[model samples]
Target: NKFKTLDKMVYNLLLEKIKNGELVPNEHLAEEKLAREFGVSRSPLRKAIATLTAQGIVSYHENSGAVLNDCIVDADRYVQLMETIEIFVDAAIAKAAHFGYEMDLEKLYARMQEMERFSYLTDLENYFDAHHRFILCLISFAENPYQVRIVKQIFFQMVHFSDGINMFKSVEIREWTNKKSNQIYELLAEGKIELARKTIKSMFAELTIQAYRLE
Candidate 1:
């Protein structure tokens, strides 16, 4: 039980380090060195690193050390990836309208409410988590498990790095983003699928300019 606890703590630490850019792109993580620094043994430390590696936070080599994965924040790549992902999300929204269960709507509404609360409190982590929950609910309602799997994998891989600077620079945009996102849930709950799609598209267009303008 204690080992389990330590493993979980180590996992969170690694994730935080990666997210906050404390461990930056291509920074090698020597297992033994990390273990010594953290005052943990090689076995548990390696296990924690392996978990992050699976999530694409870090890349590991058999002989070489682990290195942080680069976040795709380059303007061109970021724009392109967001554009591509938007298509999937837009389609998923419409499809979800046709096939979504009551539970999906409930979950989306709950997430929207939570997002509003977190936004008011200025709790960035909870706000982001709520945003993630809303999108995941839509993806699940779309009933394309394969697409869901891949999108989730890709989304988390660069989320922190992609949004890091943007979040710090634009409080107004962040507030507007939360408002617009909540509006989508309201439209969806009202069964206004077409309106929801339009709103979602407009949101992405706004984001494209803001995100890419940095570069």
Candidate 2:
């Protein structure tokens, strides 16, 4: 068995497609060609849908595929999934902190620089790269390998879904987001562990709510 790697690969590809607006809310994953397009077997594509649906990024049915979550599911369902992500992500933060995790401020600063560089240019994909790098820096500090993977997936689930849907489209909004995100690193540098954890949680919570509103 491949465990979740192929599952991850399929979901990752779907997330990329969705984030870039190559896929629309009107389409519930279609089939056949789409599956092959992502280099995944049908079963794996189904699992990918299930993965994203479980994250509340989209809605789905067995064998029929899925559409974006906001169009069909209630906001509560969206909140429910995001809160689930919040709970696990917070636990990951706590465990990392418990083990005396430390973030390299220099690296984080470089990450922030990259994020801002892409943000000002409105280059979303590279901006997302910086965002992912920033989170990877945090996740890399953790002792639990499984938790590392789960948290990383959830972050991707939350981020790519929202950006993939173009929820953070406004220029001013991007700047605002960049500011708050930089503050996250600031809190970590100050050793404000609880604040750092909550900030990360709130960022995604806000993202879920915003995506819902856009829906």
Candidate 3:
């Protein structure tokens, strides 16, 4: 458990830095320096870096060491891909609403609570975690392991270069996201399947246009 503590800390720290643009794209990670800064041995540091690499946060090259990946996609192309994925997510959420068990609903509510708690926090790290949990819950409720795997793969690929996309939005957009997502959750809880589906479609349309310009 103690070793897991170090692993998680390092993983979270890396993810935060990456999300906030502290660790710039394509920058080489100096393993020894990071180990010193985090006050951990290279063993744990390497483990952390390995984890990030697996997540596509950082990529490893045999000769070049580890480099932070530029996860940005071309704006138009990214939009197209994301819109396609959202269609799947919307369908999944609707199906899940019909089939999700009590435990699934409980987890979704828990994530919603976390999102609400962090909505106003200035810490981008916490906000990022909240959003991550929200998506995970929706994906899980979808109840299709194959679709979940595909969605995650698509998400990782699309998000690797997503920092620039975030720049397209204002702070108020966060509030909008929380409000819209909360509505989706509420509709799901009420078992209003058609309303939930429509709300999610509308939400994705609004969000997609906000983050990407159509050429």
TM-score of each: 0.71, 0.57, 0.61
For model 1, residues 1-215, the per-residue Cα lDDT tens digits are 24348888777766677667677688788667667777888888888888888777678767577887776466667677777667778888877666664537777778778877777877777766666666666666677888777767656654655663345246676677778877887888788889988988998788788876674
Candidate 1 lDDT trough over 10 residues, lowest sum: 160-169
lDDT of 2 by residue, 64-165 (tens): 657764333245655665666556656756776787866566787788778789988888777766766766666555555675577566555545443333
Pitting candidate 1 against candidate 3, the one with the higher TM-score is: 1
C-alpha lDDT of all candidate models, in order: 0.72, 0.69, 0.71
Best prediction by TM-score: 1
Compared with the true structure, the alpha-carbon lDDT of candidate 2 equals: 0.69
In what order do the candidates fall by lDDT, top score first? 1, 3, 2
**After superposition, candidate 3 runs with Cα above 4 Å error:** 1-71, 97-103, 164-169, 213-215
If both were scored by TM-score, which would come out higher, candidate 1 or candidate 2?
A: 1
Question: Which stretches in model 2 have alpha-carbon errors above 4 Å?
Answer: 1-81, 152-165
TM-score, predicted candidate 2 vs. hidden true structure: 0.57
Candidate 1's displacement at residue 154, Å, is 3.6
**Candidates 2 and 3: which is better by TM-score?**
3
